[PDB]
Structure 1
Amino acid sequence: ASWKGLIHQYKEFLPVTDQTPALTLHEGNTPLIHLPKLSEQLGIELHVKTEGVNPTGSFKDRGMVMAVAKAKEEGNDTIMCASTGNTSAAAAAYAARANMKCIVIIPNGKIAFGKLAQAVMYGAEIIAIDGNFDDALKIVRSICEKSPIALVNSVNPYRLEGQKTAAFEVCEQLGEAPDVLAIPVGNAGNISAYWKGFKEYHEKNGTSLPKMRGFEAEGSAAIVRNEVIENPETIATAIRIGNPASWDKAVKAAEESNGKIDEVTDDEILHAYQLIAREEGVFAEPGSCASIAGVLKQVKSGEIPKGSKVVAVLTGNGLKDPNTAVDISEIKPVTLPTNEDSILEYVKGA
């Protein structure tokens, strides 16, 4: 049938009133794709929730449609967020759609090319700092406390209310809750939202409770180290975050679900990044592939038992970050003369 966006489709789970604007970019309802080759190789039943087909190319659209609709309902005209790039892209698109001004603070030289192009195109006022995301978040929260500008980072609870619908959809698309929900962790709002979603669906519809398995990049694994990281690092700039704002909710999700927050190296991330594209035709940005890298690590160790039904969240479209793709990949265009014989000869001799 039809799909009219999250606010309409999940209205009973959401803080929607008759005065809530009907804001939508048709976000949500993203594919849950079975990966049969990787399932065979791993000895599990692996599906990927491909959030890169959301309107701005990441799961952030789920929370942002809710946050911006409520911000407009509650009488604001300007929104602001700090971002590694996907939240600012979402905020900018929904602000333009909603006729609100948008201001974003980003870490200079540390957001992907595609995310920058979106923020420029959607019409945000873009402020860059030489600090990291964590610096930007501190500044943004201070400013929205000291101005009438509405904060639309994940600490805004409407963001997590929108993002929990991804757990609803996974249950509906799989026909049941999975054994394991594998997910990247940056600012930790998303793993918190999925867990909140699984609990609500458990209570209302009787679905089971997955083990929540979150994965930070080793260079930014503040939760795994149990310490704030003052200079987080990782090539997966989406999750280059050393003081997650939803730290306590995420640890609670892991504990209540009998799950775990783990870490993956950049090399593990980049391997999973190439793996799913080469073997399954699925292209997600590096930070997203922490979930797949996490599945490979824990299938190897037995922490994900063979035969498990596993959903890995692919949080962002691979088109967000074309530089990493070309920088790391061994595949390069070979330049040939515009001559059928040379090309055919190359085709056969290679």
Structure 2
Amino acid sequence: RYDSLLQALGNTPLVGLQRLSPRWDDGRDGPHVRLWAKLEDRNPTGSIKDRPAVRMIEQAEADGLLRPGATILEPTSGNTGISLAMAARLKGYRLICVMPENTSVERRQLLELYGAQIIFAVATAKELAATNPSWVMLYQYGNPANTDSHYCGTGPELLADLPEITHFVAGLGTTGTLMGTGRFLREHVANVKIVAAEPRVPELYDPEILTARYSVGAVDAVRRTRELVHTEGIFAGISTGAVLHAALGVGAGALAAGERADIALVVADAGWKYLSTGAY
């Protein structure tokens, strides 16, 4: 049990995708190639961003950067603003999110609910931070706590749950997830593969870490997100569909080469915020 919602965070579960695995069972035909999904929507605000959000805030506090009633500013496409708005409400901070205007109405709603101001990005936010030195910009694209959250959280859990891992597949945005989990897995798992997925450069980016990076188009991502609810029951968000596409690429390849694989892939969020788009 937890004294706070901020604690009921991480230790997200890992689910084998039996029906979507290129080959779930070792057989006459060749060794298994398994997709395992990690459900990061099982977090305080329903996305993986709770990890860095909280770790960044607890980090600014512990530094003494943050103080009662301080204004926090963050450029975000949704998920991180939501995680920061929830944490800021519990801690007595005022959040301002700078967002692109093409973000889903669900984001806006939940942010308003949590007491966040929304400006309608990194550049704008940077300029505002400079206009108002009072305000604190945690800066998820450069903040080491972002990467540490995954190095110290997502990584170890994955490894504890899937010690036989061969690939890790995730989305590449601020890059924290792939860098932190990537750096952890690479530092512990000989010959591990770290795969990115991008839509067709942050200070957190480390060129050394990725083994592959797939570019995935919008239509493939949507397609795959639907396939995932159809086949495995998981009401994933759009990013997860692109992640799944790349994972299946990597799956086809291991299956082609006669090699075993245990592909761990991230489900960064659920479909809830994406329904207004009509992609479901």
Q: Take 1:246 and 1:181, find their aligned partners in 2: how far apart are those partners?
A: 22
**Cα gap change, 1:199 to 1:301, in 2 (>3 Å):** closer
Q: Take 2:87 and 2:240, find their aligned partners in 1: how far apart are those partners?
A: 22
8 Å contact kept, 2:23–2:34: no
Comparing both chains, which one has the higher relative contact order based on Cα–Cα distances under 8 Å and sequence gaps of 6 or more?
Answer: 2
Stretches (4+) displaced over 6 A: none
Equivalence map 1:193-204=2 (5 Å): 193-199=180-186, 202=188
Match of 2:202 among 245, 258, 261: 245
8 Å contact kept, 1:184–1:287: yes
Shift of 1:81: 0.7
Mean alpha-carbon deviation: is it higher for 44-53 or for 136-145? 136-145
Match of 2:10 among 28, 38, 55: 28
Shift of 1:188: 2.1
Paired residue for 2:111?
119
Q: Take 1:170 and 1:3, find their aligned partners in 2: how far apart are those partners?
A: 22
Which residue type is aligned with residue 159 of structure 2? Answer: C
Q: Take 1:190 and 1:137, find their aligned partners in 2: how far apart are those partners?
A: 19
Equivalence map 1:1-350=2 (5 Å): 24-40=6-22, 44-73=33-62, 74-76=64-66, 77-108=70-101, 110-128=102-120, 136-146=121-131, 147-154=133-140, 155-164=142-151, 165-174=153-162, 176=163, 178-199=165-186, 202=188, 207-208=189-190, 210-218=192-200, 244-246=201-203, 248-249=205-206, 251-254=207-210, 259-302=211-254, 306-324=259-277, 327-329=278-280
8 Å contact kept, 2:73–2:138: yes
Shift of 1:321: 1.0
Q: Take 1:138 and 1:248, find their aligned partners in 2: how far apart are those partners?
A: 18
Q: Take 2:164 and 2:103, find their aligned partners in 1: how far apart are those partners?
A: 34
Q: Take 1:171 and 1:191, find their aligned partners in 2: how far apart are those partners?
A: 14
Q: Take 2:38 and 2:130, find their aligned partners in 1: how far apart are those partners?
A: 35
Shift of 1:308: 0.3
8 Å contact kept, 2:251–2:261: no
The 3-state SS of whatever aligns with 1:38 is coil
Paired residue for 1:19?
none
Shift of 1:163: 2.7
Which residue type is aligned with residue 47 of structure 2? Answer: S
Q: Take 2:91 and 2:164, find their aligned partners in 1: how far apart are those partners?
A: 34
TM-score by length of 1: 0.70
Gaps of 5+ in 1: 6-22, 129-135, 219-243, 330-350
Q: RMSD of aligned C-alpha atoms? A: 2.4
Gaps of 5+ in 2: 25-31
Identity percentage of aligned residues: 22
TM-score by length of 2: 0.86
- Measured against aligned partners, the alpha-carbon deviations of 1:191-213 in whole angstroms (never above 9, x if no partner) come to 1121233245x2xxxx4452110
**Cα gap change, 1:3 to 1:272, in 2 (>3 Å):** farther
Higher helix share: 1
Which residue type is aligned with residue 121 of structure 1? Answer: L
8 Å contact kept, 1:189–1:246: no
- Measured against aligned partners, the alpha-carbon deviations of 1:329-349 in whole angstroms (never above 9, x if no partner) come to 4xxxxxxxxxxxxxxxxxxxx
The 3-state SS of whatever aligns with 1:178 is coil
Paired residue for 1:132?
none
- Measured against aligned partners, the alpha-carbon deviations of 1:63-115 in whole angstroms (never above 9, x if no partner) come to 1111111223314222111111111111111111111111110111x222332
8 Å contact kept, 1:298–1:304: no
